[PDB]
């Protein structure tokens, strides 16, 4: 890759092609560890202690890339030879599986392409730490990450793609804290998955299970207007990182029992004297597994692109997963009745497909469903976008002199703002009078102490609409 | 992929030794087929309409 | 019993397809025409008559529909219309125009009149010309065949 | 989304040929048009069926592309031209146009809309009028025939 | 390389011919047209590829010359074309066609542009309308027939 005569030049790779995009409302924050984070002339971890914590401002995967490295090896990845063959012993058929029996609780590389292959644009990386074997998650250094990830002002998402290997208490208090400084800082909105139960296969009804164990989570009521959980996980169609020596290999014959081999892949590798044969057979069997992902980051990226072709006013459902090929669990309509109504409020949105149409989002309901104002998830999420632009709209105006020319001028500002939302259709009404209105004033929205001080006090009221969820169909025989 | 009409050349009333093969540099934009039926149309004195019997295919 | 008539622009055209009638975009247009139907016939003379000839009905005939915009970069639509055109692959689809108006009992925005085109598919497709010395916009012109248009009642 | 439309008059022309490409005079010009495309179809009427016909598609067509400048009196692409008409010796090229607008991110020139065009020979060369008693200037306009044309996806 | 463009209202007639090209009163035109070449191509349709047509080229076409100026009442020119049209006796004769600038190493008129006509005869003649009530000129226009046109590099 060191050229020096002028000319064209040739390589040949293998790797997923890319894709980029244009996002101007929805910028997340993924929080977890990473294998490089190595920026400029410094090491973030250099050190075992006394790490650097920064968040930094990423656009595409190649940048990713450039900065944090991409995975680690697996070292559970299992393959299965099946022979059938006569009495005599004579070979009839040969083939072969793949299986992984405990996965690395790591994943920040594959969340990032799949985010990336959904429609993401630019996020900010947390690094709280290196990747390591042992598969140590600890709860201080994600509350560390968060903590560091509320000094920089544009981000609207948090995401910790890592959370569902942490115990409950510990993922309480986690999302209890970033619930609690989403509720300070007024401009976010949290995206959570649901714990299940860690068993293959998975049994039967285990979303009720795992739907009751949620509800127990103590979490503090009056936030729970800021986020939304998503269940259940999803395989997806990308390629575990592995080294080759670490795989085993087991074989089976007329459907008896499994044996344990006593050689690696490695020994199968012709250039180490091994069968070639078996060998291309084993890599074409490694290659077919699916791997299995979280959906938060599938679902952020959606928000980017429902922001983008939509509008924010619109509810985020009803859409199509990219590159996915299966939920991991089937749901019903008698399951979700418990899923999105329940006393607690405490409403769950299910990922389900559907004939000749494929995976869809189905619900757009927050934490607090019960509600009569933010039950639902577009609305939130318009008035987080409406308050940061009128903040930052009316910024330049600190340190004025408190007179009527002020409020005159920040009034102005603000319709017409809200006069060119009112236009995109994000407003209900006819005429602008009919969608929002504006007051400041002495005596009426202010005292006359207040003006001593040095504060201003608007008072704004804004008109939205909301979806409809049910469909009612009526039939009967027309006399002929 | 386009594919091209063509014409093969053989030696043998049962086709089997091939001799040859041309393949159009353009292929035609329309052509026609054409089918007959033969039938003998004699017919009895005095009498309205008739059936006809079959000869051959031509 | 009327008094006034309504105005004419005020309007909207949804197209019921792919998934294109989601997108905000797809149903802003600056010019929509070619709503019209006509019955072609034949003459006869009958002998003996020659006060009037005997006009029969034959077929209905239809006008095909045109759109005009500026020019959108990236358009679904677009991708539809090309699929067609260049691979020969057409797939037909349902459209509604409507016409619009404020009503009130405050106010909203309500469609008046609705009509359902039924079997569009791409007919012609066009951009204006390119001139150093004007002061205009790229539009673009899109022409589409259909079978009927019928009012909803 | 959308909310002001492009402008026309900013726009380019590339050569993808013998070494035209890089030839400055060779993209500057006056006007460019005849970007269109066309379906051609024919009627089918079914017996039984009178409330609508089929219309059944056909084949393609393509419309001429016309260039227009000031007259350029030492011109490699001219001899090209009357090397196909005044010998009977052709070879087709491909084109490039471009419209173009300017991004920043400090700001830059950059294509914003391409087509590919395959297949290009002269079809019609000509020059305007001479006239003693009025100001003008000698304007050449040139025509071509090509295969089809694609957008740079 | 070209900032502006030539003028057109400054041009000349050359006939190369009997003795008509020392003629003074043979060379001064009020207006010359008619200078553009066309290209004749039929079309042929290939069954399985329905992305497009093929152009074939048949033949090559040129525009008759127009001349005009204000009457001449004694012209040997005018006496060829009617020993042409009247005696029905035609001798072809070459032609150049120049455009006209100023250029200066003081100063001296050259020519910019020349094009060669090949094998020109009389086409059509001329005059003006009589009319009692209108300030007008008398005014002659020619009309000829040639093979092709060149230029001369």
Not at chain 1, 77 to 87: A, L, P, Y
Not at chain 1, 221 to 232: E, F, R, T, V
Not at chain 1, 362 to 368: E, F, I, Q, S, V
Not at chain 1, 458 to 474: Q, T, Y
Request: hydrophobic share 40%; aromatic share 10%; proline share 5%.
């Amino acid at each position: 890759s060191t050229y020096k005569t002028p000319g064209v030049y040739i390589e040949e790779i293998s790797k997923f092609p890319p894709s980029i995009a244009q996002v101007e409302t929805a910028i997340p924050a993924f929080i977890g560890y990473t294998q490089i984070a190595k920026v400029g002339v410094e090491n973030f971890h250099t050190d075992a202690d006394n790490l650097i914590l920064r968040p930094v401002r990423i656009t595409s995967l190649l940048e990713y890339e450039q900065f944090f490295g991409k995975a680690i090896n697996e070292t559970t990845i299992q393959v299965v030879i099946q022979d059938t063959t006569d009495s005599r012993g004579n070979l009839t058929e040969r083939k072969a599986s793949a299986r992984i029996t405990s996965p690395s609780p790591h994943n920040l590389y594959y969340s990032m392409q799949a985010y990336f292959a959904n429609g993401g644009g630019p996020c900010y990386i947390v690094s709280v730490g290196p990747m390591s074997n042992t598969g140590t998650i600890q709860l201080e250094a994600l509350q560390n990450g968060l903590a560091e990830v509320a000094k920089e002002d544009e981000v609207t998402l948090l995401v910790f793609p890592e959370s569902q290997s942490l115990s409950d208490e510990n993922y309480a208090a986690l999302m209890s804290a970033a619930l609690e400084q989403c509720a300070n800082l007024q401009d976010r909105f949290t995206v959570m998955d649901l714990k299940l139960p860690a068993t293959r296969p998975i049994p039967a009804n285990a979303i009720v299970g795992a739907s009751n164990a949620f509800r127990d989570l103590s979490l503090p009521q009056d936030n729970l207007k800021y986020g939304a959980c998503y269940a259940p996980d999803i395989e997806t169609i990308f390629n575990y990182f592995y080294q080759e020596d670490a795989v085993t290999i087991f074989r089976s014959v007329n459907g008896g029992a499994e044996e344990q081999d006593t050689l690696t892949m490695a020994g199968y590798n012709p250039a180490n004297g091994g069968d070639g044969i078996q060998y291309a057979l084993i890599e074409s069997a490694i290659d077919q597994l699916p791997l299995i992902l979280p959906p938060s980051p599938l679902v952020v990226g959606q928000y980017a692109r429902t922001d983008n072709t939509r509008g924010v006013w619109k509810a985020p459902a009803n859409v199509a997963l990219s590159s996915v090929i299966k939920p991991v669990l089937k749901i019903t309509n008698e399951q979700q009745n418990n899923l999105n109504v329940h006393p607690t409020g405490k409403s769950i949105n299910a990922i389900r497909a559907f004939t000749g149409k494929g995976t869809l989002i189905w619900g757009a309901r927050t934490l607090a469903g019960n509600d009569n104002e933010w039950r639902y998830v577009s609305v939130r999420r318009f008035f987080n976008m409406a308050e940061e632009s009128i903040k930052k709209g009316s910024e330049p105006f600190v340190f004025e002199p408190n007179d009527a020319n002020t409020w005159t001028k920040v009034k102005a500002m603000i319709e017409n703002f809200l006069t060119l939302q009112w236009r995109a259709g994000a407003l209900a009404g006819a005429k602008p009078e009919q969608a929002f209105y504006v007051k400041i004033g002495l005596n009426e929205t202010m005292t006359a102490l207040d003006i001593l001080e040095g504060r201003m006090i608007v008072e704004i009221g804004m008109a939205v609409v909301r979806p409809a969820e049910f469909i009612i169909l009526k039939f009967s025989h027309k006399m002929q | 992929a386009l594919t091209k009409v063509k014409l093969l050349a053989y030696q043998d009333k049962r086709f089997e030794n091939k001799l040859g093969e041309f393949e159009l540099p353009i292929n035609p934009e329309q052509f026609s087929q054409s089918f007959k039926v033969e039938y003998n149309r004699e017919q009895a004195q005095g009498s309205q309409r008739n059936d006809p019997e079959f000869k051959f295919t031509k | 019993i009327r008094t006034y008539p309504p105005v004419s622009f005020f309007f909207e055209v949804v197209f019921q397809g792919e998934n294109l009638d989601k997108d905000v975009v797809e149903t802003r247009f600056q010019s929509v025409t070619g709503l019209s139907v006509d019955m072609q016939t034949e003459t006869l003379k009958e002998g003996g008559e020659n006060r009037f000839e005997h006009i029969l009905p034959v077929r209905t005939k239809y006008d095909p529909l045109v759109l005009k915009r500026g020019l959108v970069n990236d358009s679904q639509m677009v991708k539809w219309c090309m699929d067609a055109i260049l691979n020969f692959d057409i797939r037909p689809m349902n459209l509604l125009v409507r016409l619009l108006h404020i009503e009130r009992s405050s106010s909203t925005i309500a469609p008046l009149m609705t009509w359902k085109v039924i079997n569009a598919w791409p007919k012609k497709w066009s951009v204006s010309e390119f001139n150093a010395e004007q002061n205009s916009i790229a539009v673009e012109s899109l022409e589409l065949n259909y079978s009927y248009f019928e009012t909803l009642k």
